[PDB]
Structure formats: C-alpha cells, structure tokens
Design a protein around this ligand. Structure first.
Ligand code: A1IEH
Ligand code: A1IEH
Ligand code: A1IEH
Lengths: 236, 56, 250, 282, 282, 236, 56, 282, 56, 59
C-alpha cells in the first residue's frame, strides 16, 4: 500500500490525542464507587465564595488583619471605606483568592463577577453604605459625587447582614487578558459612607466588614497556561 | 465498525474514529463531554431558598 | 431629477441642489447591536435625536497652494453637544456616521477633491523610532495640514502627501469608500459609514474608528475674479448611537 | 453496521442575559445571608436594567478532562554508558508524582483521582568532555523495565534480572520517535489518593502521610550493550498524561513552596502582597 | 452512512462574451461619471462588435484561502548546546508576525483576519569551527515550549520551568520529519487586527499602534540534555500557514520599505519610476 | 498491516494539505461576528478603480504632478496627448497601481481592461479627444491617421465628465506573462486631439486629465509567485 | 463516515476524505469554495444606476 | 456508495489472422500506388495461404502514457556548505527540459504536449578531501525554493528572500526518503511546445527558436544553516515524470547529436552505416 | 468512495483505489487506456480506397 | 493504529505510481483545445511508411 509521510511525523506534541498499545493486557480494574462530591468542571469551583484580603496596608503585623475592613462611629459626612482595581488575575487583592487561582491557569476570561459584603458588627449597630463600580476611564473617582454616577447599590444594614454587588460585564471585546494592561482595563470598585454608623451606649466603637468574591453563571476562561506562582530551583 | 461525530468549531464537520486495540485503556481521550452541575458546592443547604424571597 | 438630495436627521436638515448619489460604506446601512452579538450585560442607553443630528465641524480655506487635510473621528466631535457629554460619561460607545463635505464655486473655477474615509488609519512618526504625543494627530475639531515636502520635525507625524502618512501610494486610496468633488459637475459628497471594528463596542477616547481625508488631486485655478479662496465645510451626524457602562465623567 | 454515528453532545453554551426593566417591589434579590453557607445566585439582570444578549461562549476548555489532559515531566535522571561506579550506569526510580512541582500542584487540587495513564519517554545522549574524543560508535539502544512491587531488582547493568519474562519492557533505538505506552487504573483502592491523614501501624505509629499508600513499583533503565571506549552520558525524561479522568472533593490550591518530596512540610508565608494603603488604586 | 458524497461546488467560470452588432441609439454605455464613486460595469461588447466566446477560465487560485494558504518563515534564531553565556543557550521569542517582510506585507492587505494556524518547525545543527573537532556524539534532541501570557518564564537551560505540566510542548529528534501542530483561533476579540489606531491608556497616552494588542505569548527552545565537549550550534525556523481564512476591509498594499518591527514608521518614497517624456513608448 | 513508504515521505512541502494534531484540545473559539466589508477573492479588489501616474516626465519636482495630464488651449491640429505600453505588471506606469500590485503576486494573467478618463477642467471649457488602442505590431503609431486605424473611441466632453475605453482581450494565447517580453506583447494606448480645447474669456489656459485603471469581469490570474517590490537585508 | 467530492481538473475524478481528530482546527484547508461578489466595492451607491442610462 | 466499481477497459488485443485459401481473380490487393500518400493496408492473408490464429498480444506498453511515464534526470548540480565564493554555496537553475540528452530526445518526438508533472529530488553529501577531517556534525537540512517568473531572486545563502511567504518550498533532512511534489499544467498556451519556428519581435528580429517560450521560472537550493568547520559538498538531482499525457503531431526522431542546450544547431551526419556491397548479407 | 477495477494479467483480480488530495493533479497515472486509431496517419486521403480495387 | 513497515519502504522506484501532494493548490488549468493530429500509441507512428536506405555500398 503506497504511502507518503507528511510533515510532523515522529514529533512529540504534549497535547495530542492518539491511541497507543497497553502495557498490561487484559487488566481487571477495580469496580467504580460513587464517592460524594464529584467535580466535572473547574468553573464549579470558581463559583464558590472566598474571602478577599482587602486590607493590604503594608503594615500588617498580624496576617489575619488583611481580612477585616475597619469602620468607625464618627467619620466625616462623605468618606471612602476602600478602593481597589478590578484585575482578578493580576491585582494583589484577588491574586490568591479561590477565584484568582483558577484564572491564573488561563490567559483569557470573560463574564460577570459577584462581590458580597457581610457586616460583622454588633446587633444594635446600624448604618448605610454606597458601593459603586466605575467602568474604565482616565481617572478613578475621588469623591462620592463622582462614584455615584456609575453603577452602584445602596446597602442598608438590618436583619439581613449580607449584600451582593453584581459587577456587569462591560467590555469592548468578548474576552479580556488575565495579564491585564492599559488596553483591556476593567475599572475600579469603591465603597463610601452613605449615612454613617451609629451605635447605642455600651457597644464597641469599631466594627469590621468582610468581602467575598465569586463568578456568575456566565463566566468562562480560555487558553490553558502554566501558573507563575509556584517555582523550584532543584529537584526535590 | 466506525464512529462518526461532530467536531468543535460560533455558528458557522465530521470526523471518523476506529479503535485498534483490545483494551479500553488504549482509546483516545474523551474530551467531548461538557455536562456540569455546580449546585453541589454552591447550594448545599437542606431547605431550598428562593433568591427573591428573604434569606431568613 | 436625481441631482437634488435632502437628508433629515433629528432636528436638522441638509439640502443640496447639485450633488451625485450617496455612497453607503461597504453596502451596509448603520443599525443597532443585535442581542445575539452583544457582550455587555447591562441595559444600553439610546438617546436618539439628542445625539443623532448634524454638527458642522469648523471650516478650512482652499488656496492655490493647499495640499490637503485630515480629521480623526470620533475624537473630532469630542466637545460637540450632548454627543460629547455622552461619550465622556460612558465607558463603551457605538455609532455610525453620515459625512457631508460641501464646496461650491462658479462655472469658471477648476479643481478636483478626493473625499475618503480610512478605517484604522494608523500613522507613522516623522523620525523613525521616535514616539509622538496625542496632539500632532488629533486635537479636537481643528483640521491638520498635509505637507508637500518631507516632514522633519520629530514631534509630529510624517506629512508627506504622496505617501498619505501611511506608507502607501496615495493613488490607491480609491479602495476605501470615497467620492470626488469635481467643480465642473458637483458641489458636495455624501458618505454613510457603518460601524467597523473587531469588537461589538469600544471606548471612543482611546480608539480612532476612522480618519477623514480631503486631498486636492487637481489644484484650484481661476483667473480675473474677486474671489481669492474657496471655503470648505464638513458636517457629520452620528446614526444609531448607543452607549453603555455609565461611570464618572472623564 | 459500517457507521455508528455517535449523537452530538449538543454544545452547552453559558446562560444568556434576559432583558430587565425598572422595578419597585418588596422582593430583594440583592440582600442575602452568607451565614447559611450558601452562595448567592443573583445575576446582573436582578440589580440593573439590562439588554437581551445571546452568549455563544462555552466552558469546554475548563473540563477536568482537558485541564489534566496535558503531558508533563515528572522525573529526569542521567546514566553513563561506561564508568567505574556500578550504581552510576543505570537508573532506579520509585514511581511517584510528587517530584516535580508544577504537575504536583495541578494534581493536588483534588483529593481523589481515577484515570488511565499515558507514558512517554524522551531519551538523549551526549559525549562527555575529555582529552581524546575521536571514536566511531553505531547507534545506541536503551531498555526500559517496569518492576511491580515485590519483584526482583537488578544490582548491576549486566544482571540476570534484565531478561524480563513477565515484567513489561521496551527496547528503543535513537533516531526514532519517542517510546510510548498506555497504563490502566492500577490502584488497589477505588481511586488514587493524593492525601492520607493517617498512620501505618494500627497503634498510631510509624510512617505518616501519603507516603504510606505509595506502592506503585520501580522503573529501571540501561544501555543494552553499549560500552564505548570513552564515556557517553544519557538523560531520560518521563511524561505522564492522564486520560478518562474523574475527580472528587476539590481542595484549595497550595500557597507555600514545596520543600519535601514525601511530606507536606512548609514554611509560613504571607497571605499576599501589600500596597500603600486601603485607598490606593494607582 | 458509509459515504456522505459532498455535492459539487459547481466550477464558477468567468463571464462569457455575447455577440454584438452595429448600433446607433441614444444609449451611451461608454459615458459615465466617476464622481459618484461607482466603478463602471461596461464590457467590451458595449463599445465594439464582438464574437461569441465561451470562457472556461476560473478564479480558483485568487481566493483568499489559496492566497494566504502557503507556509512562510516568520522567525529564525540560533542557540548553542554549550557556552559560557547562559542567555546564549536557548531562545525566547515573543510571538508576532511583523518580523519577516514578505509574510508581513501579505497579511497587511487586510485590516482584520480570522483563521486557524498550522505551525511547522525546521531545525538544523552544525559543528562550530575550532582547533580540535574529533568527537562522537549521539543524535540530539530538542524541546519546544509554548508559554501563554502570564506564565512562568525559564531563566536558564536547566530551569525547573522546563517540566511543563500544562504548557504544551514538543520533543523532537534529528533525522525525522519536521515537527508540526495546529492552533485554533485564540484571539480575545472577534478577529485579529493588523492595525490599531489608538492608545493604551484612556487619557490618550502610553503605547501607540498595533503593539498594544500583541499578547500571544512566548516560545522557548533548548537542547534537552545535549552538552558536547565542543560547541554545537543549532538553528530553528518557524513557519505559519493560515487555514479556514476570512478577511475584511481590504487596504492598499504598502509601498515604502519596512524599518521597524513594531511600528509603521517609514521614509517618503517616489510614487514610481520615470521615463523620458509623456510620449516615449520604446 | 504490511506497508511500504513511497518516495516523498518525511518531506516538508510548503503548499501541502494534511491534517495535524491540535495543541489546545477542546478550545472554545470566540463567536463569529459579521463585520462589514468581507472579501472573498482578490479579483474583487482588482476590479476597483485607481489613479494611474501617467505623467512620468523624469523632471517631476512635485510628486503629485504624476497624476495630471496637461492640456492647452492652442495646439497644432493633430497632436499627441500621451502614449504608453500596455504592460500592467511590468511597465512603470501600471507597476504600482491597485491593479498592478495584485498581478505582481502572480505569473499569468488574461482578460480585458478598463481605462477611464475624467476631464477636470472648467465647466465652460469644451473639446473632443480620440483614444485608440493599437494591437501588437512592428512599430507604434506616430500620427493620428495611424492611430485611428485600430480600436478607438471618440470622446466628447459635456455634462458627463467621464469616458471609458474598454481594451479588448486580443491575444494568440489564452494567457500572458506578467513579466512580458517580445513574444507576448500587448500593444500600445495613445490619445490625440480630435478638435482641440476651446475656452471663453476669463478662464484658465490649461487643464488636466486623470486616468483610472481596472479589470473587467472576465479577468483572471494564475501561478502564485513572490512579489519583487519588497525586500530586506537584515532581521527587523 | 467518509466524504466523497470532485477534484479540480477544462471539460475532460473523485477523492475520499476522513477526519481523524476531534478538533475542527485539525481539518485540512477547505480551498474548494469559489463563490464571490464584487458589488460591495464596485457599486456601493444607494440608488442603482443602469449602465445604458446616463449617470446623471 | 461504498464502491463505484469502474467498468473494465476491455483488453484490446491485436487483430487476428483469418484462414485463406487459393485464389484466382481480378482483385489485386498487392498492387497499389504510394503516390497517393496512403499506406497500404494489406495483410499476410491477402498474398499467401494462412491458418487461423488467435492473437492475445496487446499494445498496452506502447501507449504514450506508458512511454513517457518514467522518471528521468533533467539536471544535476553541486553546492558547498561553506566556501569563500558566495555564488558557490547555492544553485540557481532556470527550468528547462533541454539539458539532458535522453529525456530531451524522448520528448522531441512530439510537437505539442500537455501533462501533469511529478518532481522528485535526490540529494547526497560528501566530505571534501583535506589535511584535517576529524569533526562531528549533526544531520544536515536542505531547502528547495521555486520562484515563478518575475519574483525576487536571492543573491546569497543568507538573503531575506529565503523567507518564502508565497513561493512554495520544501525542507528536507538527510536519511529520509527523497522529496516529491506534483505540479499541474502551468502553460499560458493550450499545450507545451517543444519547437517554435518564429521570432520574438514583431519585425522578425531578436531571439529565435524554442528559447522564446521558456518562462517557467527558477529553482534555488541551499543548506538551511549548516556551516561546517570544514567544507562539505552536496549534489542534487532533479527527476521529471509526466502524468496524464496527451501528444500531438509526431515528428521523426532526431539523428544528429545535440550540441546546444537552447538551439537546434547540429553537424551533418551520414544517413546510416555502410556494408561491402548491395548483395552482402553475411 | 472507493473505485474497484481489474488489473493487467493471457486468459488465466481486483484492486481498490482511493484519492486523498483535493487536486486532480495528485492522482496516480491513468495508464489503463488502450484505445487507438491509426487511420489518421495511414489513410489521410479524401476518397476512401478499397484495398481489393485498383488504386487508380 | 499498529503498523509494521515492509521491505521497500522509503525507496525511490523510477516506474512507480503513487499519489503525492500538489505544490500549487487550486490551480486553474488552461482550457483544453482539440489540436489536429492527436497520437495515442507509438504503433500508430510505427505503421507509417518510410524510405529504406538499401544502397549502402561503402562508396
Ligand atoms: C498515592 N498516589 C499514587 C499515584 N499518584 C498518581 C500516579 C499514579 C500512577 C502513576 N504511574 C503509573 C505507571 C504508569 C506506567 C508505568 F510504566 C508505571 F510503572 C507506572 C503516576 C502517578 C497519585 C498519588
Ligand atoms: C496583532 N495580531 C496578532 C496576530 N497576528 C497574526 C498571528 C496570529 C497568531 C500567530 N501565532 C499563534 C500561535 C500558533 C502556535 C503557537 F504554538 C503559538 F505559540 C502561537 C501568529 C501570527 C496578526 C496581528
Ligand atoms: C518550452 N516548453 C517548456 C516546458 N518543457 C517541458 C517541461 C515543462 C515543465 C517542467 N517543469 C515544471 C515544474 C515542475 C515543478 C516545479 F517545482 C517547477 F518549478 C517547474 C519541465 C519541463 C517543454 C518545452
């Protein structure tokens, strides 16, 4: 049977799909068992919440402080609580979160994101907060009047101790690079005092807030790539 | 005994496969399955909660 | 007669009593974004009428020694009515345009102009391997001058006319949508440009969608008349404009 | 029955976005309670007006089958064709996936795994430096032998054990394509376990950790009969490529650098990098 | 279903020529007006008497699929098996199609492109000149590794990063056919863009031009374990061959010679060559 | 399964069509979008008009002059306006036109051609011109009497400012070489004064004409070849 | 699952193709399409113009 | 449609011989008149008694398809891997079939031809003699490039033109099977012409003969990156094998020896050899 | 889409062929045609001449 | 798919019949024309008369 070999013969491609002989013919495998918790797609992991270390103040003697956002009883009428860049795969804030780890194995990502905030103050404390997402622009917001123009939600603290801000997918391209740059910026997220925190007598003067990050049901990734966080110099 | 199935491509296409070896471990990777269900890890509660209704 | 055309957008009207047909991009009329092609999640804003209207963009003077001019869009309309405000306040934008370029002269004048819209008209610096600021190529509605001789200043773009500042033969620009204003038999050119880009939407401050060029192939000439120059005017009108991603003003 | 015609899997696209208008009611999708351990299922359509969008994106590339379906180096070693030390003329490697960092971290995102294996070997040779190098040698040949646990182990290059009668082996010659084989699921249990929080002896004594369950055997390699007048060094790389994978019980990815090949020992590490203050965004 | 039998595409031949006789009427096909920007559709049959001719010519070879369906070199580089400088023993190339002039000019006739890619690698080796060359070395082996953006980058030939667990790689041995692979459409946008008239930062500052959208990754190559007593130099050539191509918005071909690999900079050039006078035809 | 390798195995042919493994299995490509202006054949480009630099007078200080053909009020009764060889892929006149560029990527061509002339004088000016195409011969025409024997059209200037001369495909062979020689000549094109240009008082004494070149609907090319216009000496 | 189609040849012839890989990007070039339409670039006007009739 | 089952061509055997007996009549098959230019169609059955014979002989091997369906060398040339003269490190051959005598004579029996072409390349290398030969060099690689008429031509081994983007090329490595390709009918006319009794210029001046119609292009070959410490010489042979052949207007075979590669020039030759006398038969 | 035809052999046998490439020039030589007609060169006269009858 | 190469692989036989890739994909050949005098077998030539030089008298 005449044949001719085309280019690429005898090459070893690490991502190929070919049949090969079995070294243990007629081997009897152990019967399968349905262990609880089967996972069939990394996105299932990506949609689970995880705590975001927003308090990276370059002066954290205690590591656990990175998860607590301070709040005080008496503050100016309009004041900023926190601010951060929306670079889930590159920014130090989201770099090591449960979501960030998954993205770092890929190059492209798209879809919406969820930010959940939980107030861990006293039961008698009360307050209102404004959380806003500002699409990409020449300058990030500096005052509440600037922030309130963009997408935002007014959060009221009561019996329900958690509020969810859904960051919509607004982009000129179907996908964004994990190694984000000026071209594919994503914007900023900031939180401001709406009314202020009020407490009755005999309560602590400070409280804390925590943030959770997760992906919506339209999120997706593409182009598998080797993560840069882990490295070695010598064989173990 | 050949199998014919579609191949990955937006909205704009067949390939044939035959198995040559007598052990199932020799087959090529079956990377065409896309079924998934995240409710196992995202909604592990006992009583179903409606998003519109209050959590508590 | 087919020599008379009338265009009505928003609260403005254009009437030309002596003109050719209307070129229409690559045969595609402007339209809104479809549901199955969009990517952004939130509701868009569609301020028709308020933004879809004609805006006269200053005026140039055509002399016997003129070489040509260019404008870059949509940055040219950056501070023109509610269009500018909407572009400032939004992260994403999308819109087609209708370009109308007027130029009238007596029966005893002679000359010929080329009107062409060049999408993605990337330009090179005057001195190779030297960057330039975003001021030698677009500064609002003001027109920019081509140069007959080779450019020498390092802070501005190469203005050599015969290369069009793009490294291509100027005579081959006919491939793009275009029209000719021949003083014998014409007074204006109308071009309808659909939204052309590699993505459904894009920011209008960072990306120049297309460039408008006016080049006199046959230099103006006249004799024994009191008129010393022929004014040229450019009018533009966004069509089916929609914005998205509301944010604080830039 | 000349064609079976496997039915289409039906591309599973991600969820679309439905148009939403202004609302004013007692329903409060935004408010929830994370104390229940339940992740909110809200969508952007529930908090701001949205247009109708059809998404054609798919999550095909994020499947565990594709995530782990890439060959990766797991071990490399050198052996000489001729030398004074007997132990230096062949390799003896106990099989384990903990030697190389990247593949280890990839696997360690799941507690239990069950898959077939595809093994590929890359072998290269080079002449050792020396004063006299002028020689002529025909093409070399190599032998790879797999010894299940409890089998005889060779003690020298020319040992009798190299006459495999039941142990599978591969003979390979340089200049051709790399060798390859397929290995089925060979665990005594119902699934491979990356972690094992337990001891070996019933009185909670002895070896501790995943080292207890590692009994996959050994691999030996040698030059068939090459014995050059001058030393020649060869290197072998082993690549693993899981197939038909199933995974259970995901766990958070590792953060601290690895330090031991058979232990989880580590050194405390900061949670993440720092910035000027809580408001800095530049 | 043993045969599908794809229907014929039906050879599309060019238009025929219809017989025409003497005419005398008010219709004037010859006269037109280019001011409309409309190219005349006249044919020779409309201005002189013509016979009937059947044309069997076809425009098959002018399709964009065939025009771009040819492999072309896009990059070549040299690396030594052994040397003092660490950076000289391996290659690190950021992927881009602007390095080689011919393929660049071919692509630059269209503003936007969308295609699959077929990549082929040609590798050759040669012994460096020197005073002593007598040595014996087995066949060499090479490794090609592709690193998507943001992944770890090796810093030396024997770095840990060469243990690819997710990054695709190819191991190739000299004497066989050239290596090859297929790459799908991997753009974040809906199409590759050869030109980009815009800036990186939102305030119209920073990088300018098509350099902003180039984020395809890197390619690294090295000798697996070859380390000769004397230096050996190798060269690698990369060939790209688009498949399933679609193109949009044609633009005039370039006229001035290229001068930078990441810019459109040029020097003014004459429109064309000259002749004695407007009437010279010899 | 017995087999034997035929000659040509393991060769790399740059214009082959073979299947090869995919390096990124199960990759999800971005959805397609119908961008305006799709092009499916280079001939579509080839049929668009482009300006021809006919005025190559070896003394053009200003480059733009190459596109203007001078015309004067008072000229001898019969005079030549311009002349050129019909070598679309080789002659300097057509070398760099939009049509010429496409042909230079090929070796063979066939079909008819269109030459369009537009009068850019004053509205009050008038005149008539004779444009003739002379098939190959021993000598090109020298006077109008010689030119008028071959294919020609009498052009009248009026409200319609453009006239089209269709050059018929007259050849002994089905195809012609782009690198034309004596064997595959194509002829000459010349323009002559038919009546002369007349102007009223108070008008410029000179005018200009422009020429456009394009291919008819029966044009075609063959044998892809690398163009010679572009070259480099060192890696960029 | 094999495809049979004609092969290029004036007026004076079948080949079989089978796909072996599960990704559409691995298929061979589909260089058998010859449909084309130049009216997009040659007649981009709004009002159709008849060649016989005067342009204006 | 799993089988087409092409109908049998039906072996065409030569004509049989029919039995014939004594005859005496006015018919005279033997007598004819060659003045008409008509070759007589008589058979042995028409002049002597014959038996009935069934002939199973066939003329299969005399078909033009089989007569020309044999590969033949058409050109060979040598080039060195390293040398002082730049022009000596690569080959540049204008394509033509008149260089080698046997294949030329075979083709020249027909005035016009039309066929597909199958091209095969045989490449061999050898080390040049010298005082010092001890060296080690990996396998060499070669590049063959085809340049249609009018394309750019390289001027040195490392010229930019070797980055083919549209020109087809083949990269080949020693030790494998010879390279091969298929070429369709690429004549501007309706058939290749071996002879052309005409001039180039319309005034009967300039080049004369078949040299005028030879515009098939060039072929260039070089070592990819091989540059040895000592010279290595390589030779390439080109073989042509027509397919699907059609021929017209046969002409008598040539008698005089060839003397020029682009002309019919010759020296007068005797019609044939001589013998003692008209009656000598020994 | 396979073709089956007889193969050359006196009076004392099938082979299968499949085309793999999309260009007809790649097919194998079609050396199975044996039709021929010599009357073009041997009897080019205008008036047919019967062998039995006199030439003139 | 397991396979084994039989003797004769990678050899170049000058009278073989194998398919090979085309170097000019989708090339449009010139239309055929029926030139007078087609020849389909060398025997057709062989049956034409020719003058025989019988008088080879060495002088
Ligand atoms: C404790 N488990 C051991 C298995 N390990 C994964 C694993 C399983 C099998 C292998 N190799 C199996 C194998 C495959 C092919 C061979 F020739 C051979 F000797 C052994 C490698 C890693 C996860 C942790
Ligand atoms: C800005 N665009 C970038 C893409 N460029 C065309 C292009 C696209 C992809 C490639 N190569 C993709 C690729 C293919 C295979 C690989 F292994 C690999 F790492 C990368 C080359 C050129 C046009 C301009
Ligand atoms: C004047 N004709 C020229 C053709 N000659 C026959 C002929 C035709 C073509 C060829 N080769 C064609 C060819 C085939 C393959 C290639 F790569 C290449 F560059 C050229 C050789 C001889 C008869 C006389």
């Amino acid at each position: 049977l005449p044949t001719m070999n085309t280019p690429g013969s005898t090459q070893f491609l690490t991502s190929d799909d070919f049949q090969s002989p079995c070294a243990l013919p007629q081997f009897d495998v152990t019967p399968s068992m349905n262990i609880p918790g089967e996972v069939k797609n990394l996105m299932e992991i990506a949609e689970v919440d995880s705590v975001v270390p927003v308090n990276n103040v370059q002066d954290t003697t205690d590591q656990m402080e990175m998860f607590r956002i301070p709040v005080t009883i008496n503050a100016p009428l309009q004041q900023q609580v926190f601010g951060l860049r929306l670079q889930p795969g590159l920014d130090s804030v989201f770099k090591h979160t449960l979501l960030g780890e998954i993205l770092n194995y890929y190059a492209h990502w798209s879809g919406s994101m969820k930010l959940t905030f939980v107030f861990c103050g006293s039961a008698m404390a009360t307050g209102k907060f404004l959380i806003a997402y500002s699409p990409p622009g020449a300058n990030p917001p500096k005052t509440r009047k600037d922030a309130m123009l963009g997408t935002h939600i007014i959060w009221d603290i009561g019996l329900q101790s958690s509020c969810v801000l859904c960051v919509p997918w607004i982009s000129q391209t179907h996908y964004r690079l994990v190694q984000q740059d000026e071209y594919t910026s994503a914007g900023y997220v900031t939180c401001w005092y709406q009314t202020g925190m009020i407490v009755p007598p005999g309560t602590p003067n400070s409280s804390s807030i925590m943030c959770f990050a997760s992906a919506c049901n339209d999120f997706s990734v593409r182009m598998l790539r080797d993560t840069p966080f882990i490295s070695q110099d010598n064989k173990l | 005994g050949a199998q014919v199935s579609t191949q990955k491509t937006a909205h704009e296409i067949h390939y044939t496969n035959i198995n040559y070896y007598k052990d199932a471990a020799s087959n090529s990777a079956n990377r065409q399955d896309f079924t998934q269900d995240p409710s196992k890890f995202t909604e592990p509660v006992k009583d179903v909660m409606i998003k519109s209704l209050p959590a508590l | 007669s087919d020599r008379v055309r009338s265009i009505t957008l928003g609260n403005s009207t254009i009437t030309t009593q002596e003109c050719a047909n209307v070129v229409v991009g690559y045969g595609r009329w402007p339209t809104y974004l479809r549901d199955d092609e969009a990517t952004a999640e939130d509701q868009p804003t569609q301020p028709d009428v308020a933004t879809c209207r004609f805006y006269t963009l200053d005026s140039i003077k055509w002399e016997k020694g003129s070489v040509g001019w260019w404008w870059k869009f949509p940055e040219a309309l950056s501070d023109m009515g509610l269009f500018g405000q909407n572009m400032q306040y939004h992260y994403l934008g999308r819109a087609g345009y209708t370009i109308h370029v007027q130029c009238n002269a007596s029966k005893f004048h002679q000359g010929c102009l080329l009107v062409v819209c060049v999408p993605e008209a990337e330009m090179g610096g005057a001195v190779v391997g030297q960057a330039f600021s975003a001021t030698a190529m677009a500064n609002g509605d003001k027109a920019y001058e081509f140069t007959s001789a080779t450019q020498s200043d390092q802070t501005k773009v190469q203005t050599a006319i015969h290369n069009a500042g793009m490294g291509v033969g100027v005579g081959n620009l006919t491939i793009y949508p275009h029209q000719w204003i021949n003083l014998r038999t014409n007074n204006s050119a109308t071009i309808v440009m659909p939204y052309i880009n590699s993505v459904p939407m894009d920011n209008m401050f960072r990306h120049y969608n297309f460039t408008l060029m006016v080049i006199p192939f046959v230099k103006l000439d006249y004799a024994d008349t009191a008129s010393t120059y022929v004014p040229i005017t450019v009018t533009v009108a966004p069509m089916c404009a929609e914005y998205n991603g509301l944010r604080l003003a830039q | 029955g000349d064609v079976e015609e496997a039915i289409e899997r039906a591309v599973v696209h991600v969820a679309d976005t439905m148009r939403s208008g202004p609302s004013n009611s007692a329903s409060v999708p935004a408010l929830t309670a994370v104390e229940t351990g339940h992740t909110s299922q809200v969508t952007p359509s529930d908090t701001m007006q949205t247009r109708h969008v059809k998404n054609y994106h798919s999550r095909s590339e994020s499947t565990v089958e594709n995530f782990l379906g890439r060959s990766a180096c797991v071990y490399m070693e050198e052996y000489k064709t001729t030398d004074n030390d007997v132990n230096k003329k062949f390799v003896a490697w106990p099989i384990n996936t903990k030697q190389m960092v990247q593949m280890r971290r990839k696997l360690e995102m799941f507690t239990y795994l069950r898959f077939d294996m595809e093994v590929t070997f890359v072998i290269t040779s080079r002449q050792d430096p020396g004063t006299t190098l002028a020689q002529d040698m025909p093409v070399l040949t190599h032998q790879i032998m797999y010894v299940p646990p409890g089998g005889p182990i060779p003690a020298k290059v020319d040992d009798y054990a190299w006459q495999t009668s039941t142990n599978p082996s591969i003979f390979w010659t340089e200049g051709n394509a790399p060798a390859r084989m397929s290995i089925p699921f060979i665990s005594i249990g119902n699934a491979y376990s990356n972690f094992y929080d337990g001891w070996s002896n019933f009185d909670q004594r002895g070896s501790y950790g995943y080292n207890t369950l590692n009994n996959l055997g050994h691999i030996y390699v040698r030059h068939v009969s090459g014995s050059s007048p001058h030393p020649i060094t060869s290197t072998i790389r082993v690549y693993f490529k899981p197939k038909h994978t199933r995974a259970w019980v995901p766990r958070p990815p590792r953060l601290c650098q690895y330090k031991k090949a058979f232990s989880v020992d580590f050194t405390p590490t900061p949670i993440t990098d720092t910035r000027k203050d809580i408001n800095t965004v530049t």
